[PDB]
């Protein structure tokens, strides 16, 4: 357990990048004598929120297409790469949305399109 | 050998690190017994030099050679151990001296045994096992250290000759190893920063020994004048600087902070090195150790790579070098060759050399004379480093090769101008260059060269000259419909090539052919193509360029 | 074009006469690298060509002559262009990983006859930069471990 | 299973051949212990001649191995190729394998199989060229099996020097009335 777990990052591609970069560069400083949190904190060089307010902080955390949380196990996880929208979605809702539109083009496991709310370039990897 | 080296490094680490119990003393007393008995051991314990003559015919000779190298390595490791034990005990240094005397005896035996056969084996020039950490220490202790607690006991080692040349040989072997692989042999020869640190410290040591104690202190013998320690340290310096430019280019500042930008540091270092070269030369030695002078100019070429061609110190370098080219005669081919190489390399990153090529060609034309043995020309005033034995076999080749480089550059320009159709100044600079090369060839073709490489290279370069003229007149055939007319400067260029060059070209063809395969047919092919395309150009340019031709 | 680029640049830099005359045009090397930065976003169709290109550079101008100006600098820089490319891409295009990686390894394992120094150097840079991205492409390593028995010694340690 | 794998640390460098022999004698006897035997025997010191015999000895019994192991055996078979024996052993293999009998259970193991092949041909060139010849040269029999397509595809998918060669072969195959819908 103390050994490094498989970990990766959801959210804004412009926000996620410095976390992956900083992890990659400092990961050698990971040490399996400490705890997972006590390692992660000096590895990723950031802190966590301890129950900021976990039921309602200040965000309509619903899908903003389906306007629900908990569609069939799935969580709002796919977000915009934008400061002004930051609107979460579901994989399913945002997929069905982008697969409709004429602008969208599909590479191998990726679809690029326009965020419904702000019409900025948003990526979905199935 | 290698086992003991590892052991003693491990135990030194165990002392320095592990203690800050009753185990290491075992190994200590084992080593001390080996020391004391290996002192009073000599060569008939291992039945060496006497019973088997190490022959590379028999098995037993192989046994004795392998054994001797094992012994030599053991000797060295206990040298390291005995040094590592104490703070500079006299008795242990006597033991080290005795060990070294054993080792050096074995070395002079093996040298005889590689004197019977050739030195095809790289087994006596095999690695020492001493850490580079160690060798840095050893040379610091020998030269720089003057602490009286150590001085009394080190003064016996200082009193050596053979020992001191051995010490610098070791460092040189580490350096050669570092050049050829990525890294050196012994312990911590795999972390680059540690190797770098030892590099910097070696560099400081050899600089100090060269600068403080001069070379003109040879009070050993007239056999040691090609083997002076003041020579070996500078040789090391050279290899270090090459190696560190090659491997550790992104650390030269922290490399130099051992010895503010690169310019002032390098300028101050150059001044001292070049003063050293001046005093060696200005000594006016008739014996003339050319080895030290060659190495000095070599190191100056190596160092001059870190002066920017825009710096005033760069121009100071170039002026100084040209001054050396203008003063000091120094009758040895390799000095002139290395120096001219330096001069050109510095010069061209400041300006085109075709003036200097012409002036050097003028010097060439002075000393040799002419084909007709009735042109008395001497222009020795220009450059002092031009002699009967230097400029005739040697300088011609370099000055013509540089001219070839000039022709390649202007060829690239001609190519770009043909492809292009930014117009006028390009061709103006091109024709300026080509005019000066044409005067250059006017001086070269007049000379009487020896029948070696000189004549065929001169003919080949004149073929390149006609090819360049062909490309030029081809570009003028290309361009002359759009603009309409020829610039006056092209008319002057083609006038000078018709009038000056081609007649003496013919005379030189006659001179080379009379004195007794492909280049001369190639030359006449080039000249006839030039005439044909010039006919084409003179018709299609509305300018009569055949009245200047004959 | 890239060879020509480098021949040009070498000739220029050795030579002030040309530096006076010619205005410093960007070199194709630089353009490609800049392509790669712009590439980052959404340019899968360019990157998949990039990789092929770079490996063509490496394959062609890996060393051979030990088994000088002309053979070294516009070959060394070609190969290490390859490498620069593929590293820069491997930072940012997270779906052409395991295909750089697998292609590297493909040139690692079997050859051992052509000098392959550059490939391990590349691989070292690649991995050091983010090893966490190879616990997403891990199987590709463990099948070269089955060939680790058969490899010359300098290769294996390095 | 445990004691066998521990064999090579125990025995000296002398009494190997008879063990090899005795083990080969067990190998024809029992199929359950193909893998560990082959593991050991690749590790012990044998005559090349004995190896070749064991190669043929395993390959006749190739149908008989329970699925799980089949992969690792081929690993053995395909490390144990010279340049020169390539085409006989390949032809035999190409003949003897089925893909018909085997079939989550079947498919996973097959996938691993094809991985092993993919690996093999990636990491050693000659297997590729020989292998296609072993389909091209067996133009005769109309009865070609699931395998041959799959393998041609795979090799097209990997090393690309061969693509033209595959294309020509596939045309000659189609016009010839070998290769067809079903
Ligand atoms: Zn939803
Ligand atoms: Zn948005």
From Swiss-Prot, chain A:
Highest taxon, organism lineage: Eukaryota
The annotated consequence of residue 8 to A reads: Impairs interaction with FANCI and FANCD2
Changing residue 21 to A does what?
Impairs interaction with FANCI and FANCD2
Q: Zinc finger spans (RING-type)? A: 63-119
Effect seen on changing residue 65 to A? Loss of interaction with UBE2T
Q: Which disease is it linked to?
A: Fanconi anemia complementation group L: A disorder affecting all bone marrow elements and resulting in anemia, leukopenia and thrombopenia. It is associated with cardiac, renal and limb malformations, dermal pigmentary changes, and a predisposition to the development of malignancies. At the cellular level it is associated with hypersensitivity to DNA-damaging agents, chromosomal instability (increased chromosome breakage) and defective DNA repair.
Function recorded in the entry = Ubiquitin ligase protein that mediates monoubiquitination of FANCD2 in the presence of UBE2T, a key step in the DNA damage pathway. Also mediates monoubiquitination of FANCI. May stimulate the ubiquitin release from UBE2W. May be required for proper primordial germ cell proliferation in the embryonic stage, whereas it is probably not needed for spermatogonial proliferation after birth.
In Swiss-Prot or TrEMBL terms, this protein is called: E3 ubiquitin-protein ligase FANCL
**Organism the protein comes from:** Homo sapiens (Human)
Recall the taxonomic lineage recorded for the source organism: Eukaryota, Metazoa, Chordata, Craniata, Vertebrata
The gene from which this protein is expressed is: FANCL
From Swiss-Prot, chain D:
Q: What residue range is the signal peptide? A: none
Q: Where in the cell is it found?
A: Nucleus
Tissue distribution of the protein: Highly expressed in germinal center cells of the spleen, tonsil, and reactive lymph nodes, and in the proliferating basal layer of squamous epithelium of tonsil, esophagus, oropharynx, larynx and cervix. Expressed in cytotrophoblastic cells of the placenta and exocrine cells of the pancreas (at protein level). Highly expressed in testis, where expression is restricted to maturing spermatocytes.
Its domain of life reads Eukaryota
Region entry Interaction with BRCA2, spans: 40-126
Sites of the modification Phosphoserine?
A: 14
Q: How is it modified after translation?
A: Deubiquitinated by USP1 as cells enter G2/M, or once DNA repair is completed. Monoubiquitination requires the joint intervention of the FANC core complex, including FANCA, FANCB, FANCC, FANCE, FANCF, FANCG, and FANCM, and proteins involved in cell cycle checkpoints and DNA repair, including RPA1, ATR, CHEK1 and BRCA1, and is mediated by FANCL/PHF9. Monoubiquitination prevents DNA release from the FANCI-FANCD2 complex.
Indicate the disease this protein is implicated in: Fanconi anemia complementation group D2: A disorder affecting all bone marrow elements and resulting in anemia, leukopenia and thrombopenia. It is associated with cardiac, renal and limb malformations, dermal pigmentary changes, and a predisposition to the development of malignancies. At the cellular level it is associated with hypersensitivity to DNA-damaging agents, chromosomal instability (increased chromosome breakage) and defective DNA repair.
* Job description of the protein: Required for maintenance of chromosomal stability. Promotes accurate and efficient pairing of homologs during meiosis. Involved in the repair of DNA double-strand breaks, both by homologous recombination and single-strand annealing. The FANCI-FANCD2 complex binds and scans double-stranded DNA (dsDNA) for DNA damage; this complex stalls at DNA junctions between double-stranded DNA and single-stranded DNA. May participate in S phase and G2 phase checkpoint activation upon DNA damage.
Q: How does it assemble?
A: Homodimer; cannot be ubiquitinated and does not bind DNA. Part of a FANCI-FANCD2 heterodimeric complex that binds and scans dsDNA for DNA damage. Interacts directly with FANCE and FANCI. Interacts with USP1 and MEN1. The ubiquitinated form specifically interacts with BRCA1 and BLM. Both the nonubiquitinated and the monoubiquitinated forms interact with BRCA2; this interaction is mediated by phosphorylated FANCG and the complex also includes XCCR3. The ubiquitinated form specifically interacts with MTMR15/FAN1 (via UBZ-type zinc finger), leading to recruit MTMR15/FAN1 to sites of DNA damage.
Protein family (similarity comment): Belongs to the Fanconi anemia protein FANCD2 family.
Q: What is this protein called?
A: Fanconi anemia group D2 protein
Covered part of the full sequence, start to end and full length, is 209 to 415 of 1451
């Amino acid at each position: 357990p103390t050994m490094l777990p498989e970990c990766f990052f959801l959210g804004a591609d412009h926000v996620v990048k410095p976390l992956g970069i900083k992890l990659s560069r400092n990961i050698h400083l990971w040490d399996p004598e400490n705890s997972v949190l006590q390692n992660l904190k000096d590895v990723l060089e950031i802190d966590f929120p301890a129950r900021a307010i976990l039921e309602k902080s200040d965000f309509t955390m619903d899908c903003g297409i389906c306007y629900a949380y908990q569609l069939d196990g799935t969580i709002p996880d796919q977000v915009c790469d934008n400061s002004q929208c930051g609107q979460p979605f579901h994989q399913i809702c945002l997929y069905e949305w982008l697969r409709g539109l004429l602008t969208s083009r599909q590479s191998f496991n990726i679809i690029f399109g326009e965020c419904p709310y702000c019409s900025k370039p948003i990526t979905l990897k199935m | 050998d290698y086992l003991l080296c590892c052991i003693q490094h491990c135990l030194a680490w165990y002392k320095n690190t592990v203690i800050p119990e009753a185990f290491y003393e075992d190994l200590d007393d084992i080593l001390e017994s080996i020391t004391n008995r290996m002192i009073k051991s000599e060569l008939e314990d291992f039945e060496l030099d006497k019973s088997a003559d190490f022959s590379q015919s028999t098995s037993i000779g192989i046994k004795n050679n392998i054994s001797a190298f094992l012994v030599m390595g053991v000797c060295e490791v206990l040298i390291e151990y005995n040094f590592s034990i104490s703070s500079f005990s006299k008795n242990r240094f006597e033991d080290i001296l005795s060990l070294f005397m054993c080792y050096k005896k074995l070395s002079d035996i093996l040298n005889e045994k590689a004197g019977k056969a050739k030195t095809k084996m790289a087994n006596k020039t095999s690695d020492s096992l001493l850490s580079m950490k160690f060798v840095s220490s050893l040379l610091t202790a020998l030269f720089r250290d003057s602490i009286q607690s150590h001085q009394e006991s080190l003064s016996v080692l200082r009193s050596s000759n053979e020992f001191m040349r051995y010490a610098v040989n070791v460092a040189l072997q580490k350096v050669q190893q570092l050049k050829e692989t990525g890294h050196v042999s012994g312990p911590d020869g795999q972390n680059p920063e540690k190797i770098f640190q030892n590099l910097c410290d070696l560099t400081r040591v050899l600089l100090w020994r060269y600068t403080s104690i001069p070379t003109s202190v040879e009070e050993s013998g007239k056999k040691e004048k090609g083997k002076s320690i003041s020579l070996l340290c500078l040789e090391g310096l050279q290899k270090i600087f090459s190696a560190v430019q090659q491997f550790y280019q992104p650390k030269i500042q922290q490399f130099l902070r051992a010895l503010v930008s690169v310019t002032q540091r390098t300028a101050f270092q150059i001044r001292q090195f070049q003063r050293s070269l001046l005093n060696l030369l200005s000594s006016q030695e008739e014996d003339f150790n050319s080895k030290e002078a060659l190495l000095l100019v070599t190191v100056l070429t190596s160092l001059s790579k870190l002066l920017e061609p825009s710096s005033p110190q760069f121009v100071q370098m170039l002026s100084w070098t040209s001054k050396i080219c203008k003063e000091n005669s120094r009758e040895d081919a390799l000095f002139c060759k290395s120096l001219m190489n330096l001069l050109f390399s510095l010069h061209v990153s400041y300006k085109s050399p075709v003036i200097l090529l012409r002036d050097l060609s003028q010097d060439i034309h002075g000393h040799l004379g002419d084909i007709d043995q009735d042109v008395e020309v001497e222009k020795t005033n220009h450059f002092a480093i031009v002699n009967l034995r230097t400029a005739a076999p040697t300088v011609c080749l370099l000055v013509l090769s540089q001219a070839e480089k000039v022709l390649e550059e202007v060829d690239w320009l001609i190519t770009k101008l043909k492809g292009q159709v930014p117009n006028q100044p390009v061709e103006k600079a091109i024709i300026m260059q080509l005019g000066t090369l044409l005067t250059f060839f006017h001086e070269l073709v007049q000379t009487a060269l020896p029948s070696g490489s000189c004549v065929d290279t001169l003919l080949k370069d004149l073929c390149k000259m006609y090819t360049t003229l062909t490309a030029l007149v081809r570009y003028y055939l290309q361009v002359c419909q759009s603009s309409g007319g020829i610039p006056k400067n092209m008319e002057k260029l083609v006038k000078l090539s018709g009038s000056h060059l081609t007649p003496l070209c013919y005379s030189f063809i006659s001179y080379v052919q009379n004195k007794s395969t492909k280049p001369i047919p190639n030359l006449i092919f080039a000249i006839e193509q030039y005439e044909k395309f010039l006919i084409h150009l003179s018709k299609k340019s509305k300018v009569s360029l055949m009245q200047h031709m004959k | 074009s890239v060879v020509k680029s480098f021949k040009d640049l070498q000739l220029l830099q050795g030579s002030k006469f040309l530096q006076n005359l010619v205005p410093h045009r960007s070199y194709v090397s630089t353009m490609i690298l800049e392509v790669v930065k712009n590439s980052v976003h959404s340019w899968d169709h360019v990157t998949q060509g990039l990789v092929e290109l770079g490996f063509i550079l490496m394959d062609s101008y890996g060393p051979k002559k030990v088994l000088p100006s002309l053979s070294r600098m516009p070959n060394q820089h070609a190969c290490k262009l390859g490498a620069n490319i593929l590293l820069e891409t491997f930072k940012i295009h997270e779906m052409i990983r395991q295909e750089i990686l697998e292609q590297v390894l493909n040139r690692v394992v079997t050859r051992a006859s052509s000098p392959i120094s550059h490939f391990l150097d590349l691989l070292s840079n690649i991995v050091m930069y983010a090893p966490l991205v190879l616990q997403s492409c891990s199987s590709k390593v463990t099948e070269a471990f089955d060939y680790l028995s058969f490899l010359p010694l300098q290769t294996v340690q390095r | 299973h445990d004691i066998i794998t521990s064999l090579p640390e125990i025995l000296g460098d002398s009494q190997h051949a008879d063990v090899g022999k005795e083990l080969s004698d067990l190998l024809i006897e029992n199929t359950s212990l193909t893998v560990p035997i082959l593991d050991v025997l690749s590790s012990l010191r044998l005559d090349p001649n004995f190896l070749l015999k064991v190669r043929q000895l395993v390959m006749d019994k190739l149908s008989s191995i329970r699925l799980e192991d089949l992969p690792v055996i081929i690993k053995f078979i395909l490390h144990s190729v010279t340049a020169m024996d390539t085409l006989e052993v390949i032809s035999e293999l190409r003949e003897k394998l089925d893909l018909q009998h085997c079939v989550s259970s079947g498919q996973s193991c097959i996938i691993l199989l094809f991985d092993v092949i993919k690996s093999a041909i990636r990491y050693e060139k000659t297997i590729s060229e020989a292998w296609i010849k072993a389909i091209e040269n067996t133009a005769s029999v109309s009865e070609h099996k699931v395998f041959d397509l799959v393998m041609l595809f795979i090799i097209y998918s990997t090393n690309t020097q061969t693509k033209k060669y595959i294309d020509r072969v596939l045309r000659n195959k189609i016009r010839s009335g070998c290769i067809q819908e079903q």
